[PDB]
Amino acid sequence: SSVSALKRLERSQWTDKMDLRFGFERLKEPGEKTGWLINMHPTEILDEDKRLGSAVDYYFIQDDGSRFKVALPYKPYFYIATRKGCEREVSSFLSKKFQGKIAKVETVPKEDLDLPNHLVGLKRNYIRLSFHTVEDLVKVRKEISPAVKKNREQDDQLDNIVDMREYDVPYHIRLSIDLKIHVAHWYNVRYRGNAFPVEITRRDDLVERPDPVVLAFAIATTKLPLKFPDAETDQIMMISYMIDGQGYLITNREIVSEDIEDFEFTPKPEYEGPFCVFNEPDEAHLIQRWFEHVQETKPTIMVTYNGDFFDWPFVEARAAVHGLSMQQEIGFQKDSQGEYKAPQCIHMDCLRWVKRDSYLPVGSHNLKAAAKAKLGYDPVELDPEDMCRMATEQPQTLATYSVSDAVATYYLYMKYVHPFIFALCTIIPMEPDEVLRKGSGTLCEALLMVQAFHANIIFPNKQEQEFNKLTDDGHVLDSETYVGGHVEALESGVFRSDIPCRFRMNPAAFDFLLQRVEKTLRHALEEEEKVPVEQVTNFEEVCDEIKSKLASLKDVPSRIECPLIYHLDVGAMYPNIILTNRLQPSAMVDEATCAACDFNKPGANCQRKMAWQWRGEFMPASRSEYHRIQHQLESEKFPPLFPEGPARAFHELSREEQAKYEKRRLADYCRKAYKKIHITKVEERLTTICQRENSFYVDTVRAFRDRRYEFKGLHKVWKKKLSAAVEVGDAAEVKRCKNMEVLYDSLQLAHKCILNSFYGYVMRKGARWYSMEMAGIVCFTGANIITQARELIEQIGRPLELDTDGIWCVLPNSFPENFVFKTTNVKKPKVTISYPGAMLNIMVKEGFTNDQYQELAEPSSLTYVTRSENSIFFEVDGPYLAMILPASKEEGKKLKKRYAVFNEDGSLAELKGFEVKRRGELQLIKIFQSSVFEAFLKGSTLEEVYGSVAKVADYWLDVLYSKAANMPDSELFELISENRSMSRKLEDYGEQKSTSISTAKRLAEFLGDQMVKDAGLSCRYIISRKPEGSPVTERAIPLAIFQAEPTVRKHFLRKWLKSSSLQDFDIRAILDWDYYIERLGSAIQKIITIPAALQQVKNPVPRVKHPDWLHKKLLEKNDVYKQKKISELFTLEGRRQVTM
Amino acid sequence: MFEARLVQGSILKKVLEALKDLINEACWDISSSGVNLQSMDSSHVSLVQLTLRSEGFDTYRCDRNLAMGVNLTSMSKILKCAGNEDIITLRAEDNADTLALVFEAPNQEKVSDYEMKLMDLDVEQLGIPEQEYSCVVKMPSGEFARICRDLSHIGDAVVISCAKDGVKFSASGELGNGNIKLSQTSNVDKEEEAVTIEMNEPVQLTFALRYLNFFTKATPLSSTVTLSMSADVPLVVEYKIADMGHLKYYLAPKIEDEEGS
Amino acid sequence: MFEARLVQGSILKKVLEALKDLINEACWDISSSGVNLQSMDSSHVSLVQLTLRSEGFDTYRCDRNLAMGVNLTSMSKILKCAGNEDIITLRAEDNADTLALVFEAPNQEKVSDYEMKLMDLDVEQLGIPEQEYSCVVKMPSGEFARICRDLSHIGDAVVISCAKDGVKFSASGELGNGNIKLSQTSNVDKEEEAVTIEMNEPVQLTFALRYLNFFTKATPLSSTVTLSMSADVPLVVEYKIADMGHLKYYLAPKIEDE
Amino acid sequence: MFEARLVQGSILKKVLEALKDLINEACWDISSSGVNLQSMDSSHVSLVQLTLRSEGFDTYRCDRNLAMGVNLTSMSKILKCAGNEDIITLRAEDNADTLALVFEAPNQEKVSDYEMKLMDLDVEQLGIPEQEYSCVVKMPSGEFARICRDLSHIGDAVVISCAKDGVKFSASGELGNGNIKLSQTSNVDKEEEAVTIEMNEPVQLTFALRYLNFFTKATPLSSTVTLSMSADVPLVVEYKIADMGHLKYYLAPKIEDEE
DNA sequence: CCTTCCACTTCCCAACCCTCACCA
DNA sequence: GAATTGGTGAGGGTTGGGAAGTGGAAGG
Ligand SMILES: Nc1ncnc2c1ncn2[C@H]1CC[C@@H](COP(=O)(O)OP(=O)(O)OP(=O)(O)O)O1
Ligand code: SF4
Known part of the structure; x- marks a missing residue:
């Protein structure tokens, strides 16, 4: 013990000196002050006996820039539950058993959601056990868990313990919840002297935040040509950093050939970027200077773009080369998770945000892309190969680059990350390091724990995992799942409002609409706008122009019209469905629990029933064969965990091993003994939801949704102001409002991920509140709604795409579109509605709306009042000028999830699923697609629509058939390259064959494991002809060899082309040209030609073959002889059926 | 009941092998005159007719006229178990739940028997020109x-x-x-x-x-x-x-x- | 050092292909009294046993008992190359890790001569229990x-x-x-x-x-x-x-x- | 005019079964000395040379030397339509784009006639070297x-x-x-x-x-x-x-x- | 001595499994 | 320990079953 106690005291002292060096004086003397809570960490301190006890150091900042710490001690605890009436015996046994190891035991009544009949308000006792330190809890739980575990497996006084709860909650996440202590609030702090605990308590009086000091920095290094740098060989050239809008640079003047001086760099009038410069005479002096300037300026937040990957390990190792202990001087140490963290300050990495929250494609997680998109400017270009030469020959260009990376990192941190993270920290118990780093499911578990604690609900333990559970028909299940979002792609080709389109229409549909127009407008005005129909003057003017245009349609359904392109989707669909049905992960029930409920009375409306589709996959082996294979494994012997160990018996394997071996045995058996390894089955199931169960989860979703909706409303208002400024023509006002629009859009998007996590969380492995049904019901109702909207729209017009949320459609030019209403209240002087939304919305309202919603009226009387509610609403988007969709090469397959759409202004609005967006698909495909979509905008008739694109897309085929004759020799190395990347270590992919693994093994021969060693390897390769007929995976040649030295290139190409006699080693000879021609052909076929034959036009591209099936069906269309049916030559005598 | 025997199963084999490709299912017309089959391909371009007179069988009984539906590719499976020279026997009973088949070797060294499961079908009848053809x-x-x-x-x-x-x-x-x-x-x-x-x-x-x-x-x-x-x-x-x-x-x-002009 | 000769070489080919697909690899057992083999299908549902008496070979030299792992696909893809009337020689060293196969054509003008690598196996082995087959x-x-x-x-x-x-x-x-x-x-x-x-x-x-x-x-x-x-x-x-x-x-x- | 006759039609059938894998489209040439074909393979790994002397045909007329582009993959499928004992006759006119293949069963009870379109190809070739190989x-x-x-x-x-x-x-x-x-x-x-x-x-x-x-x-x-x-x-x-x-x-x- | 039937080998396509990254 | 969900495109490799072609031996 003593060694650990002394080590803990030693490090606690060291940390107290480390933060005292940064000016965070401890509140040693009694007094009362106010400050802002900026950070926290857990700690142990010495009590009135100088016994060690656990505590949390809260770090505060004052408005004058003074700073301080308080340690608050708090005794952690967890709960146990006994068998009936055993609490006094068990508590006496526990208290004698571990005397001096436990602090207090006590009996607390609490409500547990799973308890029978709990709605009455019944509750059960638990015993809390609390300890003088977390270290004794961490020990003592291991004394108990096996006993209660074996008791559970069946189900002394220890056996009377029936269960234990909350034993794994992180200590400080317990503390912040239990005391309602939260970050980014102003607090009183009062220390009475050691006779009492310290008091911390929030004051809501104060709005304005303090303005804490924040530092960003970036680095660049020497490196070997064509390979990564390494911490042994290479030395830092420059470090650039900014604090609070002042910039600084340090340069190694021994490598950098001339003195550097202060300069100013301004990406935008808002980003002024003044940079001071220091020149240092050695790497050791550069490091020392930076360490000292940090010790001077004493920042509290420090930031890097992807810091844990390169900057900290590299600068740490370069410091250790000169003996400078970065862990001592600065205080950053690499944590167990590989993350650089410090006791006295916060380290925030922007890439942990961009990855999780930005909704940028993986294509743009590069700093230059995320800055270019969010900030709207380009940071500056360098190649890692040139930095050393450029810093030698022309230092200021590398200075400019390294400064630019600083400017981008700082402003990107300030505008987007600072408001969002520090807002969110107000409601999540975690530190800013933890809230930024943690995964989206755990954050939401923290918010739910906050609410559950306020509700005084004892948590459930984490969900333990089954393996190889059986179906009731005895087959071992491979997988279970719920059927996901519905998707269909009904049409193909091109649509433009500019040119006519054929329609046909059901004449009873217009009658059905016209018979209800008034109700549709009444409901749409009153519920969506909330402006009552009494508060508006001219309601009867619009209704007659609607009815007249509907009658004009009814009398002439069949027509040719231009299309109106509109998109109809449901905002925040799955949250809104959860709310509207009052779905909660705890609330699904069976009859057996309802059989105990005292509210199970005639005339009740407490239970709701909804349907979902279960899906499973299972192996064909019988129950008998599996059980026999288990019995057969009883004789098996297995190797040890390590070569020196004794061989294990089958029963000395753990469950997590046994299940995998049984799976492998049963799969290999079935591969012989039955034809099919996996059978897939889908089944309709109905599940019952209680509508009275405690609302804490649903209320949590309500609150977070409303938080998003505030930002969404602000975005709408700023878009309105933008549109006005655009029509007025004030470019400065447009520019300002566009800045506001982008900012608020990014905020509400970022909120979208954590909001939606409330849906997915309910399935996540181990989650506390876990149930699959609620994950199904919200997918299946989301299939129903959009199916019925497909039915309704398909009669009026032509659906073109249906994803999970929202239709794209074309409507006939005469349809009602927009109406304007004049109110009697200046709060909302004018109101606008567009009819497609009201029409769909009333359809949703009639069927889906809940008429069973219940709420508790009076906690003392157990009386509930029924209500009705619907939060599901469509909202229109559009109109749009042009829409295009591709088509699949396989006959009758519908190529979903690809299209292009254009704004009325003639500029790209959306463009989805294509290689231009994916990270690293073949560059030639990206450029072809990009130009052809720009070409579809042009031309005036459906003949010319395609004829335009033909004249463009011919260019690339002409290039390929020309062997790029005039293309620059370097330009091919761009144009022909794929850029694919890998997620795992090559040592783990191992035996499998594909182009990525193959080219990584190709790299091992040339440059060895220094590249292979770790995840994130990226490849550039071309596929080559010479080993004719070798299967494609074996012809992958990386561009690295075209970059290598001539003798090494010629050696490796000889080694892999199996060519001795070749003089001209050249990519232009080496390329397997027809592979690239067929890749382009099977691209262009999907976008121009098959979309043409499906639109009744002659072949747009002479050079590209039609697929054989198409050519046959087109040719059968196009000749003078027609195949009569036999029924047209011989009379039909009658119809007969035969039955047994 | 229906009951028949045929001395050479190769005939019925070659028939099933010829029907198998063109039509998926049909229902037999069984009567004291013999057996007939007529059916139309699923694309209605072409039409199949078969006649098997009772006088060609070794023995024949048909106590009442009958019809029963058969999936022909499933029958083209089972009949692949009949030997090239085996004698074959068919039996059915008036509920038409199953068709019994029996095969015997020329020397009765062996006996093989099967129960083809029958099915329900709907089908239309076409007329016959009976013209002379030019x-x-x-x-x-x-x-x-x-x-x-x-x-x-x-x-x-x-x-x-x-x-x-x-x-x-x-x-x-x-x-x-x-x-x-x-x-x-x-x-x-x-x-x-x-x-x-x-x-x-x-x-x-x-x-x-x-x-x-x-x-x-x-x-x-x-x-x-x-x-x-x-x-x-x-x-x-x-x-x-x-x-x-x-x-x-x-x-x-x-x-x-x-x-059309 | 082991050597054996068999004139009706097709016996080896047929008996090999009756296993070629069913069992991945197995250890052949060699003694002065004959050549022997046991193995199980990787499914562990079935057991294979083979025995050839040394009395039946055209020639047989075996100085000490030996055991040798092989994967049958490698032998099969070689024994394809033997004509059905070729005389087959198997030659092996307990000193080494390859098996040599020599095919002598009865025209006495064609000969063929192959070597393949053994596999490194060892296996836990029991005899079949005798039973009174009812x-x-x-x-x-x-x-x-x-x-x-x-x-x-x-x-x-x-x-x-x-x-x-x-x-x-x-x-x-x-x-x-x-x-x-x-x-x-x-x-x-x-x-x-x-x-x-x-x-x-x-x-x-x-x-x-x-x-x-x-x-x-x-x-x-x-x-x-x-x-x-x-x-x-x-x-x-x-x-x-x-x-x-x-x-x-x-x-x-x-x-x-x- | 060109025409030729061959009673051993099976030999002409089996020639194209050999050639079709090494070259799928090639040019034949015809002369008073006989019929020739030579080319590199499509992979340009190897070279093939074939000739049948005019003296081998049962009748033969060649008024001018000519060269015919043909898709071997298609002409092989055409020749699959001849019976092995059938007499094969070939003809084309010098202006023609079309080659006629006629097969006669020796019974003369059946005749089958096929027309194939030529194609207009030009071909790279050199006179084959030879040596007294060691x-x-x-x-x-x-x-x-x-x-x-x-x-x-x-x-x-x-x-x-x-x-x-x-x-x-x-x-x-x-x-x-x-x-x-x-x-x-x-x-x-x-x-x-x-x-x-x-x-x-x-x-x-x-x-x-x-x-x-x-x-x-x-x-x-x-x-x-x-x-x-x-x-x-x-x-x-x-x-x-x-x-x-x-x-x-x-x-x-x-x-x-x-x- | 000649012709047919059966077995064995070769060739081709369809169906299913692997990965990464965008779409909801 | 720490870890949201399901749908689909594109490119590539593996497996198994059917059709076609040739040779032998069996039958007359
Ligand atoms: N990250 C995620 N995790 C779980 N489910 C997700 C998800 N992203 C989408 N879903 C599921 C559940 C929601 C569903 C539709 O996602 P839309 O993008 O259409 O967003 P919507 O909610 O309609 O809000 P809008 O963006 O229109 O304001 O997809
Ligand atoms: S749904 Fe109704 S019957 Fe069932 S548990 Fe809830 S209140 Fe009781």
Whole structure:
């Protein structure tokens, strides 16, 4: 013990000196002050006996820039539950058993959601056990868990313990919840002297935040040509950093050939970027200077773009080369998770945000892309190969680059990350390091724990995992799942409002609409706008122009019209469905629990029933064969965990091993003994939801949704102001409002991920509140709604795409579109509605709306009042000028999830699923697609629509058939390259064959494991002809060899082309040209030609073959002889059926 | 009940093997006169007829006329277990739940038996012209099957022309053309090997070869085939089973737009 | 150092292909008394045993007992190259890790000469327990082969029942159940045509037909095949390899829960 | 005009079964001396030469030399429509874009006529070199076909060695290595089975088996094969086609210099 | 001595499994 | 320990089953 106690005291002292060096004086003397809570960490301190006890150091900042710490001690605890009436015996046994190891035991009544009949308000006792330190809890739980575990497996006084709860909650996440202590609030702090605990308590009086000091920095290094740098060989050239809008640079003047001086760099009038410069005479002096300037300026937040990957390990190792202990001087140490963290300050990495929250494609997680998109400017270009030469020959260009990376990192941190993270920290118990780093499911578990604690609900333990559970028909299940979002792609080709389109229409549909127009407008005005129909003057003017245009349609359904392109989707669909049905992960029930409920009375409306589709996959082996294979494994012997160990018996394997071996045995058996390894089955199931169960989860979703909706409303208002400024023509006002629009859009998007996590969380492995049904019901109702909207729209017009949320459609030019209403209240002087939304919305309202919603009226009387509610609403988007969709090469397959759409202004609005967006698909495909979509905008008739694109897309085929004759020799190395990347270590992919693994093994021969060693390897390769007929995976040649030295290139190409006699080693000879021609052909076929034959036009591209099936069906269309049916030559005598 | 015995299962095997490709299911017409089958392909271009007279069976009973539905490819499975020279027996009982089959070796060294499960079907009946046809030809069945296979390689559709001097098959495609011509056999070597043309007046027609490639699976039934053709009406092919009866296919031709004019 | 010569070399080819697909790799056992082999299918449902007596070889030299792992695909892809009348030599060193195979053509003008690498295996091995087989049958091979082939289209398991009056094979499935009877014959034109049952008490058992679709590949070894059975005991299929040896497959019956 | 007649139509059937894999589209040429074809293969690994002398045809007219672009893949499928005993007749007119193939059953009860479109191709070719090769080996073709199949089972390539006593082949690969010799026959019993060697100087060379395993496709065309080999020159594999013709494959050795 | 049937080998396509990254 | 969900495109490799082609031996 003593060694650990002394080590803990030693490090606690060291940390107290480390933060005292940064000016965070401890509140040693009694007094009362106010400050802002900026950070926290857990700690142990010495009590009135100088016994060690656990505590949390809260770090505060004052408005004058003074700073301080308080340690608050708090005794952690967890709960146990006994068998009936055993609490006094068990508590006496526990208290004698571990005397001096436990602090207090006590009996607390609490409500547990799973308890029978709990709605009455019944509750059960638990015993809390609390300890003088977390270290004794961490020990003592291991004394108990096996006993209660074996008791559970069946189900002394220890056996009377029936269960234990909350034993794994992180200590400080317990503390912040239990005391309602939260970050980014102003607090009183009062220390009475050691006779009492310290008091911390929030004051809501104060709005304005303090303005804490924040530092960003970036680095660049020497490196070997064509390979990564390494911490042994290479030395830092420059470090650039900014604090609070002042910039600084340090340069190694021994490598950098001339003195550097202060300069100013301004990406935008808002980003002024003044940079001071220091020149240092050695790497050791550069490091020392930076360490000292940090010790001077004493920042509290420090930031890097992807810091844990390169900057900290590299600068740490370069410091250790000169003996400078970065862990001592600065205080950053690499944590167990590989993350650089410090006791006295916060380290925030922007890439942990961009990855999780930005909704940028993986294509743009590069700093230059995320800055270019969010900030709207380009940071500056360098190649890692040139930095050393450029810093030698022309230092200021590398200075400019390294400064630019600083400017981008700082402003990107300030505008987007600072408001969002520090807002969110107000409601999540975690530190800013933890809230930024943690995964989206755990954050939401923290918010739910906050609410559950306020509700005084004892948590459930984490969900333990089954393996190889059986179906009731005895087959071992491979997988279970719920059927996901519905998707269909009904049409193909091109649509433009500019040119006519054929329609046909059901004449009873217009009658059905016209018979209800008034109700549709009444409901749409009153519920969506909330402006009552009494508060508006001219309601009867619009209704007659609607009815007249509907009658004009009814009398002439069949027509040719231009299309109106509109998109109809449901905002925040799955949250809104959860709310509207009052779905909660705890609330699904069976009859057996309802059989105990005292509210199970005639005339009740407490239970709701909804349907979902279960899906499973299972192996064909019988129950008998599996059980026999288990019995057969009883004789098996297995190797040890390590070569020196004794061989294990089958029963000395753990469950997590046994299940995998049984799976492998049963799969290999079935591969012989039955034809099919996996059978897939889908089944309709109905599940019952209680509508009275405690609302804490649903209320949590309500609150977070409303938080998003505030930002969404602000975005709408700023878009309105933008549109006005655009029509007025004030470019400065447009520019300002566009800045506001982008900012608020990014905020509400970022909120979208954590909001939606409330849906997915309910399935996540181990989650506390876990149930699959609620994950199904919200997918299946989301299939129903959009199916019925497909039915309704398909009669009026032509659906073109249906994803999970929202239709794209074309409507006939005469349809009602927009109406304007004049109110009697200046709060909302004018109101606008567009009819497609009201029409769909009333359809949703009639069927889906809940008429069973219940709420508790009076906690003392157990009386509930029924209500009705619907939060599901469509909202229109559009109109749009042009829409295009591709088509699949396989006959009758519908190529979903690809299209292009254009704004009325003639500029790209959306463009989805294509290689231009994916990270690293073949560059030639990206450029072809990009130009052809720009070409579809042009031309005036459906003949010319395609004829335009033909004249463009011919260019690339002409290039390929020309062997790029005039293309620059370097330009091919761009144009022909794929850029694919890998997620795992090559040592783990191992035996499998594909182009990525193959080219990584190709790299091992040339440059060895220094590249292979770790995840994130990226490849550039071309596929080559010479080993004719070798299967494609074996012809992958990386561009690295075209970059290598001539003798090494010629050696490796000889080694892999199996060519001795070749003089001209050249990519232009080496390329397997027809592979690239067929890749382009099977691209262009999907976008121009098959979309043409499906639109009744002659072949747009002479050079590209039609697929054989198409050519046959087109040719059968196009000749003078027609195949009569036999029924047209011989009379039909009658119809007969035969039955047994 | 229905009960029948056939001394040589190769006949019924060759029948099922010829029906298997063209029609998925059919229901048998069983009566004291014998058994008949008629059905139409799922694309209604062509029509199958079979007749098996009771006098060809070794023994026959049909206590009442019956119909029952069969999936023919499933029957083409089970009958692959009958030996090439086995004697075969069929039985059914009036609930028509199952068809019993039994096979016996020529020496009764072995017995094999099966229960084909039956099914329910709906089907329509077509009328029969019974006209004379302006041209008829009789031909070696293997030679017609060769003509169909080879010309089918050239293209999807065949032109027939028949005239008193001879008969011609022709076809075309992107490769070019094929023509095959037959004439009267000058003197009969044997009646199965002679080609004979009888006609009123010449005829020309066109047909989709795809169905002829399903018709020629009859070739192992007989060395002989008959073709009957008349202007602007279906072509008929006939194969004959010496004692049992006949198998015939009717194919609707292609007609020109000129009637559209 | 081991060497052996066999004039009817096709015996090695046929007996190899009757295993080529069924077992991935196995260890061959060599002694002065002969060559021996046991292995199990990686499914562990079935056991293979082979024995060749050294008396049957055209020449046999074996100075000490030896064991050697091989993966049968490698041998099979070589023995494809032997003509059916070529004389086959196997030569190996207990000092080394390769097996040499030499084919001498009876025209005495063609010779072929191959070497392949052994595999490094060792395996835990037991003899078959002797049992009083309550039922045994001798059959011509083609009848059993056709029975298993035909029944495989009806379904994926066979139920066999037998007594001194005959053996019945039966199966059931969605496409229709069926049976074959082989009643016990009393007279034959030749012993190669005889079916012959012997019984202590009747037996009935269920077998996985997609495995007998492998055990049938030994048919070209022999005109006749032997079956033996008892309740709760593996079925034995046995083939005799000319005068020089025997090949046996042992397979457990399907367990029934009831 | 051009026309020609051939009663052994099966030989013309089996020629195209050989050629179709090595070149899918090629130009024939026709002369008063006979019919010729030669080309590189599409991979340009190997070279093929074939001729049938006009003296071999049962009648033959050639008023002018001409060259015809033909898709071998299609013409092979056309020739699949002739019966093996059918007499084959070819004709084309000098202005024509079309080649006529007519097949007669000797009964004359059936005639079949086919028209195929030519295509307008121009072709790169040079007059084939030849030398008195230091080694020549004559063998029954079926044995060489089995040998090449057997070595292709084991691995990539064969080394071929000739000596006064016998001809030897050897190869190696991942699973093993293998060696074969055929001795010279001591006294020929019948000429179809004799293996015989001419040997001026020892020769050894390496060859990639893929191309021998194509050249063997002519095996049904002639009962015996000849291999002509020497240092520093392509191997020739030669088949002789009855009286009228011959088929020569030219293949360069695999090169060891890379060491 | 000649012709047919059966077995064995070769060739081709369809169906299913692997990965990464965008779409909801 | 720490870890949201399901749908689909594109490119590539593996497996198994059917059709076609040739040779042998069996039958007359
Ligand atoms: N990250 C995620 N995790 C779980 N489910 C997700 C998800 N992203 C989408 N879903 C599921 C559940 C929601 C569903 C539709 O996602 P839309 O993008 O259409 O967003 P919507 O909610 O309609 O809000 P809008 O963006 O229109 O304001 O997809
Ligand atoms: S749904 Fe109704 S009956 Fe069921 S538990 Fe809830 S209140 Fe009781």
